[PDB]
Design an enzyme around this catalytic site. Structure first.
Site, PDB file in Angstrom:
ATOM      1  N   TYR A   7     -20.477 -18.457  15.538  1.00 19.16           N
ATOM      2  CA  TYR A   7     -19.530 -18.232  14.449  1.00 19.16           C
ATOM      3  C   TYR A   7     -20.320 -17.822  13.221  1.00 19.16           C
ATOM      4  CZ  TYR A   7     -15.523 -19.157  11.300  1.00 19.16           C
ATOM      5  OH  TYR A   7     -14.507 -19.107  10.360  1.00 19.16           O
ATOM      6  N   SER A  32     -12.613 -14.257  14.799  1.00 15.88           N
ATOM      7  CA  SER A  32     -12.362 -14.287  13.346  1.00 15.88           C
ATOM      8  C   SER A  32     -13.647 -13.893  12.538  1.00 15.88           C
ATOM      9  CB  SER A  32     -11.796 -15.673  12.965  1.00 15.88           C
ATOM     10  OG  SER A  32     -11.277 -15.655  11.626  1.00 15.88           O
ATOM     11  N   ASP A  50      -0.694 -12.408  13.900  1.00 16.60           N
ATOM     12  CA  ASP A  50      -1.761 -12.957  13.054  1.00 16.60           C
ATOM     13  C   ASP A  50      -1.522 -12.577  11.596  1.00 16.60           C
ATOM     14  OD1 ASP A  50      -4.087 -13.890  11.858  1.00 16.60           O
ATOM     15  OD2 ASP A  50      -5.401 -13.197  13.473  1.00 16.60           O
ATOM     16  N   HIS A  68      -2.918 -16.600  14.628  1.00 13.86           N
ATOM     17  CA  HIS A  68      -4.371 -16.523  14.565  1.00 13.86           C
ATOM     18  C   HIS A  68      -5.040 -17.378  15.621  1.00 13.86           C
ATOM     19  CE1 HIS A  68      -8.144 -15.445  12.866  1.00 13.86           C
ATOM     20  NE2 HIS A  68      -8.499 -16.711  12.735  1.00 13.86           N
TER      21      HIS A  68
END
Length: 676
Positions: A452, A532, A615, A650
């Site tokens: 991430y 994301s 989203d 999302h």
């Protein structure tokens, strides 16, 4: 690559520099041509996925694994217990309650019954202190937009009056009288642009049984869409706090006694964050001020100036302090030591009492409970250990297993390593590596590397049953604790944001190189996954160093970093990424913006884009433009698919059956493109 995508010659001059945007036309999802293209892209992806290997076996196995019997930690209010369960024959979790520890439980909220097709989800819920009411969010498509409702527990009646739209950011704070709650509210004003909307959050008070138009305005908006506004309330109702959050790196804190005319400034953060809990007329302040790995101060509300604060828990010599809770008349302190948590109980004066003895190596939550309850719970997982909940006594340290998720797997077949590798600049970065004990270290295992790298988010040893077919097929699963996360405190986060974002990508490229150096795998057998900000991660990785990777799975991503701030919730991430509206920020963003770095005459890794149709946080346009660029890149022979999940926010559709389908698709893509 199937459906054609017209490329246009759109160019803009930004800060003296020409920026090309060939697929600008795909931004506006209201255009029929774009909807037609979306449908065709998704159809192509589903057709392609359906031919990939192992699908019937994967689906049967994921059905065995993803439907579980589980129970959440309980919220205790006035002798009643409230908690969520999953069942093996339900698509969504259900909120239950019971009277007393062993009273018969009753369904309170069952979102499976809120629509015929699973398209309305339960969001946040907050039980009143008397245990008689629950305030809760309903969220279409499990997207962010939310409406608050209230249910009467004894009768199960939903209030027809206590219905509040604009509850996206709300977490209701009930007053001790259970007569109403403080909450974060957004106006529905059609003249507010979606990108500016985050600057309009207001704190309001809703009195139960009255029209929400009469709700009092507790704190006005900031007018700044690069902030969040959040409230909290002490247990005794005597201290109301309002936070102005400037991204994930700094915040202000205001407070008052309810009924006072003005808010008082506790602290204006300058490159520091502050979180406050009040108990028995003392404030406990968790902060990184002068302490990158955080520390705790006791503050007297009667003498609240900074000079009068008393340090009660100093910064640890090595461990990162993540959170503080007040439970059972004590402080519970959640630390991270090389990305693994440790929980320590201290007195209210900060004196060590004990360390919670964990069942093994894995991830533990902080203790959860109440300031005036001796029983507190924590959750433990590991990469090979399904969730266990322990019930502990704060005063004595007694600990008992309270719940355990039974999963049809044998944990003894697998092992988890923790390794440390050097990044380009010499930084030692942690990584977890998970595989069968009998893995051959022959440089050829199919490997999936996850990261991430941002927003102070830590990668922990969560149990994911989704990786088990991969491990059983001889695969390796690796999770890197990249900079931009919070694993080593403020310095770790700061070294992976703003002008230093490239360090995150460099840390990830080095993880990929390490897995090859250490004989787990080779580039053609290596896949990367992120979602994301992690979607940005894998897009950057594949555009910078495509030769390191065999496949990329990119979920709900940010990819045009020159334009991200114009859509959805984007302005709220300006404190993390910067904005191309500013010249220096533009130079940084443009240098890595994946959409602007799909060079021609390059063989890219195979690409599976996992998008969501609803989203309302990360605009779906990023995935459309990027997939178009990759499909049409001269000399790219590798597959590039856009899969669009229906009725999904999302975080997905909140339907177990759809999660099964998504995992079948993901892992069958991998099996195909890595030749498993």
């Amino acid at each position: 690559s199937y459906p054609a995508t017209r490329a246009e010659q759109v160019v803009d001059t930004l800060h003296g520099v020409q920026v090309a945007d060939p697929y600008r036309w795909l931004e506006d999802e209201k255009a029929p041509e774009v909807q037609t293209w979306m449908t065709a892209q998704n159809a192509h992806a589903r057709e392609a996925l359906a031919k990939f290997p192992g699908r019937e076996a994967l689906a049967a196995r994921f059905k065995e694994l993803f439907y579980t019997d589980s129970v959440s930690t309980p919220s205790r209010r006035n002798g009643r217990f409230f908690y969520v369960r999953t069942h093996k024959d339900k698509e969504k979790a259900i909120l239950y309650w019971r009277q007393g520890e062993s009273g018969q439980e009753k369904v309170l909220l069952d979102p499976n019954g809120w629509s015929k097709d699973g398209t309305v989800s339960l969001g946040t819920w907050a039980v009143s202190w008397d245990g008689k009411k629950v305030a809760f969010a309903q969220k279409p498509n499990a997207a962010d937009e939310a409406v608050l409702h209230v249910i009467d527990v004894d009768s199960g009646e939903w209030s027809k009056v206590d219905v509040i739209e604009g509850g996206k950011y709300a977490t209701p704070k009930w007053t001790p009288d259970s007569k109403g709650f403080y909450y974060e509210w957004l106006p529905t004003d059609p003249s507010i642009k979606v990108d500016e909307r985050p600057g309009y959050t207001t704190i309001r008070y809703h009195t139960l049984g009255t029209e929400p138009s009469k709700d009092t305005v507790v704190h006005e908006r900031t007018g700044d869409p690069t902030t969040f506004l959040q409230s909290d309330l002490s247990r005794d109702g005597k201290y109301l706090f309002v936070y102005i959050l400037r991204g994930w790196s700094e915040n202000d804190v205001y407070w008052k006694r309810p009924g006072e005319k003005d808010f008082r400034l506790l602290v204006k953060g300058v490159g520091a964050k502050y979180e406050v809990h009040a108990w028995k007329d003392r404030f406990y302040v968790l902060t990184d001020e002068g302490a990158p790995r955080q520390r705790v101060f006791e503050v007297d509300p009667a003498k609240p100036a900074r000079a009068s604060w008393k340090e009660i828990v100093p910064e640890d010599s090595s461990a990162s302090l993540l959170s503080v809770s007040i439970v059972g008349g004590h402080l519970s302190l959640e630390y991270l030591k090389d990305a693994t948590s440790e929980v320590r109980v201290a007195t209210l004066k900060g004196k060590p009492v004990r360390t919670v003895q964990l069942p093994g190596v894995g991830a533990a939550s902080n203790l959860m409970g109440l300031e005036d309850l001796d029983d507190a719970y924590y959750v433990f997982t590991s990469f090979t250990t399904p969730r266990q909940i322990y019930k502990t006594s704060v005063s004595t340290g007694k600990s008992e297993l309270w719940a355990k998720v039974d999963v049809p797997m044998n944990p003894e077949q697998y092992q988890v390593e923790q390794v440390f590798y050097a990044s380009k600049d010499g930084t030692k970065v942690p990584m977890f590596v998970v595989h069968r004990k009998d893995l051959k270290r022959d440089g050829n295992a199919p490997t999936l590397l996850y990261g991430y790298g941002g927003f102070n988010v830590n990668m922990e040893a969560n149990f994911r049953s989704s990786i088990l077919p991969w491990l059983d097929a001889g695969g390796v699963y690796a999770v890197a604790n990249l900079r931009g996360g919070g694993e080593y405190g403020k310095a770790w986060h700061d070294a992976g944001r703003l002008d230093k974002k490239q360090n995150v990508f460099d840390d990830f490229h080095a993880a990929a190189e390490y897995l090859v150096q250490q004989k787990y795998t080779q580039p053609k057998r290596l896949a990367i996954y992120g979602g994301s900000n992690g979607g940005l991660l894998v897009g950057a990785a594949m555009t910078q160093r495509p030769e390191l990777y065999g496949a990329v799975v990119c979920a709900v991503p940010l990819l045009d970093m020159v334009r991200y701030h114009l859509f959805g919730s984007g302005r709220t991430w300006i404190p993390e990424y910067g904005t191309a509206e500013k010249p220096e920020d533009f130079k940084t963003l443009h240098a890595y913006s994946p959409y602007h770095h799909v060079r021609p005459d390059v063989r890219y890794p195979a690409l599976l884009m996992m998008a969501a149709d609803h989203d309302d946080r990360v605009d779906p346009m990023h995935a459309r433009k990027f997939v178009a660029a990759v499909q049409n890149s001269p000399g790219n022979p590798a597959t590039a698919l856009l899969r669009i999940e229906a009725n999904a926010g999302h975080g997905g559709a909140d339907q177990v059956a759809k999660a099964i389908e998504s995992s079948v698709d993901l892992y069958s893509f991998l099996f195909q493109v890595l030749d498993v």
